[PDB]
Paper text:
Fatty acid-binding proteins (FABPs) are involved in the uptake, metabolism and intracellular trafficking of fatty acids. Based on epidemiological studies and animal knockout models, the isoforms FABP4 and FABP5 were identified as potential diabetes and atherosclerosis targets. The aim of this study was to develop a dual FABP4/5 inhibitor and, to this end, high-throughput and fragment screens were conducted with X-ray crystallography as a follow-up method on those ligands that showed appreciable affinity and favorable physicochemical properties. Structure-based drug design (SBDD) based on initial hits from high-throughput and fragment screens yielded 216 ligand-bound structures of human FABP3, FABP4 and FABP5 isoforms, many of which were at resolutions of better than 1.2 Å.
Tetrazoles were among the most promising almost isosteric replacements for the fatty-acid carboxylate group. Their calculated pKa values are about 3.8, in the same range as those for fatty acids.
Residue numbers in the entry: -2 to 131
Write the structure that this text describes.
Amino acid sequence: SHMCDAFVGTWKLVSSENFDDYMKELGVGFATRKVAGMAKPNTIISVNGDVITLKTESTFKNTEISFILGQEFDEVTADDRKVKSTITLDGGVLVHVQKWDGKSTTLKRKREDDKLVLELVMKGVTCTRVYERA
Ligand SMILES: Cc1c(C2CCCC2)nc(N(C)C(C)C)c(-c2nnn[nH]2)c1-c1ccccc1
Ligand SMILES: [Cl-]
């Protein structure tokens, strides 16, 4: 048993607040924002030993990251940013920091009731996206 077991499973988007705003703060273009904002992504989270995999499937884009907690990795995001990423587990919350071009954004995932709640922060903007088991 792993702490990340709380996160393992297939998760579907059920609500979103301020995602367009968050995407604007990152400099995401209009067409990507419109189509991605519309989409209904699922996330499959799996653990295999020390390696955690987060795989996104949608009609917009499919993406995958695999990582070990605390070990920096190069990530190319869905909006084509080339970032240095580090993901850690802090007091039960998966905390993902991305660094690029002297900027930073933090993505936090936490379990709340039967939900997986994603809090995205860029500069002053917080977006909350809520996911439930598929
Ligand atoms: C385009 C996109 C983005 C980019 C815009 C902001 C930075 C990258 N970030 C996402 N999440 C929430 C994280 C990684 C920030 C998601 C996403 N939403 N749920 N899972 N992934 C999506 C998304 C993918 C496919 C279908 C719809 C939306
Ligand atoms: Cl997620």
